[PDB]
């Protein structure tokens, strides 16, 4: 309603009714993190690269805020590809179609976005601090883009006895404008709970007035209350420098035999992917499905009639008719998103309290085992609240649907709580 507006002016920047990566015909799926816009068939294998490279939402089919969409409104795919691209030719270009060899389209979007071939070359450590008071969000793009590393902290001007990290930097001399850039900064190498006199980013928002900052720092789930060399907290300096309007979000920031299974789970959780390479043995690709699946896995003399549901934001109140006549349930869970978990942890206590829904076996699959920072399956349990869950049959269970570890295992977990 005051989304539909901003998704209209999304859709309408430079570029970007053409695909980002194979150019097709006006392209509904938002790459977040990066402000650009894929065909669902490019969109897949950003799906696939992960939450760490890239982060999907579809504008048809999510639900999305104000706040997500502030990248995609500074960005878009023109603007984007000028950098990313840059060094890409007119004829034979490795770059696709609308409907192109999948192969094709995979090889070369692992290419652009992990390996970042195409991207306008270059070394550099001041020419980005220049960049960030400059608000010039394209050039910390081709930084990024070469390999910096925003992790690690640059040198600034005279008298340079401290030494400050390119983050905590962007906040310090940021307004209305520069917000896109902090953005991109947390959600791209951005090593938000960093340190270096020992002050979070999240101190320095409260010192410098810094009320949108803070606003995108939670947003990225922050770590309050850390202490620094004075042993001072987030809300500590809010009071010592006395900027009234951040503290109001500080003191928020607190509060024979067969069986029917159900699959669900949050959007490129992988639970197409787990489906199918139990049903074919082979590992296959996938584009976001759009409606459901079903496919009988007959593992060990026992016959599964899965019903793979896809979980947009707006295709998951349908998951309530799946519900009559379930046995048992797989909560697929994505490992690598740890943005993402209280969401998974309210759709799960959403689904196994439906009364409809009581006699239901739970298995939690902890899929993406093999992502870089995975989060562990004991991990899971805790942050999914299955702590005080008695009374119910829970059994989370790592895996790796790539690969097929963890899957069988799974099964027969099913299999044997099946009693
Ligand atoms: N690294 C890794 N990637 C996975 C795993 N499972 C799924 N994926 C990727 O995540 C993407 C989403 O999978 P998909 O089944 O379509 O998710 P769905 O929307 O829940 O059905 C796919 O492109 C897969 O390549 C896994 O265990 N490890
Ligand atoms: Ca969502
Ligand atoms: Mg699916
Ligand atoms: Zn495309």
């Known amino acids: 309603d005051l989304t539909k507006l901003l998704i209209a002016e999304v859709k309408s920047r430079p570029g970007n009714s053409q695909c980002c990566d194979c150019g097709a015909a006006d392209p509904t799926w938002l790459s ?27 504008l048809t089919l999510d639900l999305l805020g104000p706040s997500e969409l502030l990248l995609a409104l500074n960005m878009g795919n023109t603007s984007f590809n000028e950098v990313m691209e840059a060094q890409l030719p007119s ?11 999948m192969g094709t389209r995979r090889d070369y979007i692992m290419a652009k976005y992990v390996e970042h071939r195409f991207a306008r070359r270059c070394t550099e450590p001041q020419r980005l601090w220049t960049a960030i008071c400059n608000r010039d969000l394209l050039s910390v793009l081709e930084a990024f883009a070469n390999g910096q590393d925003f992790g690690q902290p640059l040198p600034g001007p005279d008298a340079q006895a401290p030494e400050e990290l390119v983050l905590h930097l962007a906040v310090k001399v940021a307004n209305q404008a520069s917000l896109p850039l902090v ?33 995108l720092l939670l947003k990225g789930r922050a770590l309050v209350g850390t202490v620094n060399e004075a042993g001072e907290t987030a809300l500590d300096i809010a009071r010592k420098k006395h900027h009234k309007e951040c503290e109001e979000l500080l003191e928020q920031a607190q509060a024979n035999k067969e069986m029917r299974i159900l699959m669900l789970g949050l959007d490129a959780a992988g639970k197409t992917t787990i489906l199918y390479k139990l049903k074919l043995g082979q590992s296959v690709t996938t584009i976001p499905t759009v409606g459901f699946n079903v496919e009988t896995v007959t593992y060990k003399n026992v016959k599964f009639n899965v019903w793979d549901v896809g979980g947009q934001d707006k295709i998951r109140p349908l998951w309530r008719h799946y519900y009559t006549g379930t046995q048992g349930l797989i909560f697929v869970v994505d490992c690598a998103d740890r943005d993402r978990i209280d969401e998974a942890r309210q759709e799960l206590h959403r689904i196994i309290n439906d009364r409809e829904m009581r006699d239901a076996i739970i298995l939690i699959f902890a899929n993406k085992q093999d992502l870089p920072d995975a989060m562990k399956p004991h991990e899971i349990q805790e942050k999914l609240g299955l702590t005080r869950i008695r009374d119910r049959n829970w059994y989370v269970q790592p895996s790796c649907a790539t690969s097929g570890d963890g899957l069988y295992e799974g099964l027969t977990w099913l299999t044997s709580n099946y009693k």
């Open 32 to 58: 977040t993190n990066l402000g650009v816009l894929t065909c669902i068939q490019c969109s897949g294998v950003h799906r696939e690269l992960g939450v760490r490279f890239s982060r999907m939402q579809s």
């Open 183 to 215: 953005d991109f900064i947390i959600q791209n190498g951005g090593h938000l709970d960093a340190k270096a006199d020992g002050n979070t980013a999240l101190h320095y928002a409260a010192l410098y007035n810094q009320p949108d900052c803070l606003k």
């Open 91 to 101: 004829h034979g270009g490795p770059k696709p179609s609308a409907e192109s060899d």
